[PDB]
Design a protein around this ligand. Structure first.
Ligand SMILES: Nc1ncnc2c1ncn2[C@@H]1O[C@H](COP(=O)(O)OP(=O)(O)O)[C@@H](O)[C@H]1O
Length: 327
């Protein structure tokens, strides 16, 4: 569907229904995914149009050389990086293949994409290639990847119009943007940056930073768009449990409702579940596992609760108590 690329605000709206926080990154991703697809669409419009007017534009669009906006997502693990990508790829119904930088301590990647788009060369060439942990790399993998990102022919697939998205935590980058970098400091500094600032300084990263980190200028140039995500705070985590369209709590309420039980998570209960996910550093990924751990018993004997109201509390969450069944 290169027929209609929803506006950046529309895309961002979809994003908002699944990703909490990361407002800037959401904005940057939306505009970036839009510009990428507006171009492929616009470009396709002319060709079909097949005439002299639309043919001059095609030449100018080529002459001007509109660099492909491959994206580079930088943010702590579990912040919504591949989620943002997955969310939109599912909305625009675009085939997307996720991979791992470590896999290359190859063409194999484009293979999954084909599998993800029914071997239809066309849809695959309009798809997304997600490279996670681009930060884990060695100096060879990059170049081996660069050929494909830059755009080449592989056997057959043409990777020229494939949107590349690289992601990583770049654990080191934090300090690098706090050594030989602008907005320096003349005063007496008390100690190493707190991960709060060590994650807030990233939002001030420039291309020369990714280099120092160990990224070949050849690849960084291929990632015009840099987007940084924060770490999930307690408040956002609290929102993730209840706000999104597919929020865990609504899943559990949907499931309990089928057996005519009204399931309620008391505020401090949600706060406790969220605070747990952080400690255990199991992140947002670990929310379902924490809920299952104190809900299993409840779901096991749910019938003797039919028609009533089950109220989840902090104690219950901490498994220091039973849930509040209310007639
Ligand atoms: N910002 C977020 N908003 C809502 N859910 C999130 C967010 N970040 C992470 N999650 C949850 O945790 C999982 C980790 O997702 P992901 O973004 O792909 O990780 P990473 O940022 O390391 O690439 C998601 O699939 C989702 O269920």
């Amino acid at each position: 569907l290169l027929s209609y690329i929803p506006a950046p605000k529309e895309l961002k709206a979809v994003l908002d229904n699944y990703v909490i926080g990361q407002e800037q990154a959401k904005k940057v991703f939306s505009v970036a995914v839009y510009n990428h697809y507006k171009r492929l669409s616009f470009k396709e419009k002319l060709k079909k149009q097949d005439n002299q007017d639309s043919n001059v534009e095609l030449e100018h669009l080529e002459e001007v050389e509109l660099s492909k906006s491959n994206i580079l997502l930088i943010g702590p693990t579990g912040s919504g990086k591949t989620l943002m990508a997955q969310t939109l790829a599912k909305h625009l119904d675009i085939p997307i293949a996720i991979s791992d930088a470590t896999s290359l301590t190859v063409e194999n990647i484009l293979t999954r994409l084909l599998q993800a788009s029914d071997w239809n060369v066309q849809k695959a060439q309009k798809g997304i290639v997600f490279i996670d942990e681009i930060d884990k790399i060695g100096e060879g993998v990059q170049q081996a990847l660069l050929k494909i990102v830059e755009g080449s022919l592989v056997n057959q697939i043409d990777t020229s119009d494939i949107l590349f998205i690289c992601a990583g935590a770049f654990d080191g980058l934090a300090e690098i943007i706090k050594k030989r970098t602008t907005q320096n400091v003349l005063g007496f500094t008390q100690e190493k940056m707190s991960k709060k600032e060590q994650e807030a300084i990233l939002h001030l990263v420039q291309t020369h930073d990714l280099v120092t980190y160990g990224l070949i200028p050849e690849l960084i140039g291929r990632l015009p768009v840099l987007s940084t995500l924060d770490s999930i705070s307690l408040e956002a985590m609290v929102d993730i449990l209840q706000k999104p369209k597919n929020a865990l709590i609504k899943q559990y309420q949907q499931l309990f409702k089928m057996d005519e039980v009204d399931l309620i998570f008391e505020e401090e209960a949600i706060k406790e579940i969220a605070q747990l996910a952080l400690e255990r550093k199991t992140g947002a990924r670990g929310l379902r596992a924490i809920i299952e751990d104190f809900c299993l018993d409840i779901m096991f004997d749910l019938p003797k609760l039919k028609g009533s109201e089950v109220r989840i509390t902090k104690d219950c969450v901490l498994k220091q108590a039973e849930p509040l069944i209310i007639a």
